[PDB]
Design a protein around this ligand. Structure first.
Ligand SMILES: Cc1noc(NC(=O)CC2CCCC2)n1
Length: 435
């Protein structure tokens, strides 16, 4: 496993103990061999759970999700997927880790795909070893993998709107349900319907995950309404998963705008991970998985793989060489390696628009490659009229940094900047020069 030029896919079924049993074995083995090691957690929630499984082992925790005084002599680093890729993009020294361990290595967010591309390229160059930990490696066709205890799989019509009748099985349940919805706004409507029915609902999304997930432990609940973010190692004590089997897909249209297409079927990997939230207790057979559609390989043409190429094109590897995508997922995008390579100043802008600016990768690239500096926000208002951002059927309005009320009308339209109320609120602050 740990010998150089080796990439190992640890593809044990969900709940088989890859994180709490195998990972500590690997780490103390790497420490014994004096292997400089990075451990990549998908979320800060998983990072904290890793500290529990690795407590007592000398691990440097490069995340504020853990309150640990470090000795400085640790050769094992732990950080989130996004942090790894961020540090590669920034002008700071990143060690050339001899061992690279990515947990929940199926994560399809751009910074996770890029991290796999960079790591797998170093392995292919014979410079490092890597272990990708996931029950669902890229290209999985099995949406019903093995589990610790038998699961009741039922294909059933699943609501995606509020309902008044026809779905008694949803509310008649007396256990705890994790419900995968295609979007935040879709989850809002389902959540309000359940709450009106007397249910206690917790809602999880990417922006609220590292805070709202604590509620699943601190208070009692009946339903968790979650987007696909809970595919990344989120553990619940539930006995039922309701799966719409649907997701949104960011799609670049004509190379000039990003739309959120769908909802449309999830991949087999996503369906397996959603189902894999339950059936994890061998002493509690008969957890239920209700799914409301089929699977399809909807990661092809998905904007995240193009955005991953935008990131990797701007990460130094060796002279002019450029890291390739991890080969099992390299065909999901039609992109020329290097075509998004920016020069020094435009690359700095690109990085700042993604970090401080909190813009989607694709949008950050359009602005940076147009030669616009980070604080120049005139592009948020000089787009075409079809690019007018709407909220509550009225055009969105902000006060510009000059003190002028203007309609939000970005030169490049990325639907992710206004996918829900919170997203648009953040983009309005950006357009106003507030960060
Ligand atoms: C999903 C999604 N939304 O935005 C992003 N941005 C990035 O992954 C860029 C990386 C990560 C941190 C800074 C550099 N991914």
């Amino acid at each position: 496993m740990l010998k150089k030029k080796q990439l190992t896919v640890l593809d044990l079924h969900p709940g088989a103990g890859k994180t709490r049993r195998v990972l500590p074995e690997i780490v103390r083995e790497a420490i014994k061999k004096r292997l400089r090691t990075v451990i990549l957690a998908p979320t800060r929630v998983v990072a904290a759970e890793m500290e529990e499984a690795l407590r007592g082992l000398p691990v440097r925790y490069m995340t504020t999700a853990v309150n640990v005084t470090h000795s400085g002599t640790e050769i094992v680093d732990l950080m989130c997927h996004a942090t790894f890729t961020s540090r590669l993009l920034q002008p700071i020294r990143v060690p050339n880790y001899n061992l690279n361990i990515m947990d929940e290595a199926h994560f399809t967010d751009p910074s996770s795909i890029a991290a796999r591309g960079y790591i797998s390229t170093r392995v292919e160059m014979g410079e490092a070893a890597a272990i990708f930990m996931t029950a669902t490696p890229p290209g999985t066709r099995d949406a019903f993998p093995d589990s610790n205890s038998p699961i009741m799989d039922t294909e059933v019509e699943v609501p995606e709107r509020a309902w008044s009748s026809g779905f008694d099985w949803v509310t008649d349940h007396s256990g705890k349900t994790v419900w995968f919805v295609p979007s935040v706004r879709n989850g809002n409507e389902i959540a309000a319907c359940l709450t009106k029915a007397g249910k206690r609902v917790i809602q999880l999304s990417r922006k609220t995950f590292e805070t709202e997930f604590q509620k699943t432990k601190n208070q009692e609940w009946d339903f968790v309404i979650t987007t696909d973010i809970s595919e990344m190692g989120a553990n619940f004590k539930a006995d039922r998963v309701i799966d719409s089997r649907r997701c949104l897909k960011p799609v670049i249209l004509d190379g000039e705008r990003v739309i959120l297409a769908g909802p449309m079927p999830v991949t087999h990997a996503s369906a397996a991970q959603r189902r894999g939230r339950i059936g994890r207790n061998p002493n509690k057979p008969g957890d239920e998985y209700m799914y409301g559609g089929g699977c399809a390989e909807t990661d092809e043409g998905h904007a995240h793989w193009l955005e991953a190429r935008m990131l990797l094109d701007n990460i130094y590897l060796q002279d002019g060489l450029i890291a390739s995508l991890y080969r099992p997922e390299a065909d999901k995008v039609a992109a020329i390696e290097g075509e998004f390579k920016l020069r020094t100043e435009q690359r700095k802008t690109f990085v700042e628009l993604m970090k401080r600016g909190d813009l989607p990768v694709w949008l950050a690239y359009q602005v940076a490659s147009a030669g616009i500096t980070y604080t120049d926000r005139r592009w948020c208002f000089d787009g075409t009229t079809n690019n007018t951002i709407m909220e509550d059927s009225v055009p969105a309005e902000v006060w510009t940094k000059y003190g002028e009320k203007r309609v939000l009308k970005p030169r490049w339209m990325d639907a992710r900047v206004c996918s829900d109320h919170a997203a648009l609120k953040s983009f309005k602050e950006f357009a106003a020069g507030k960060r």
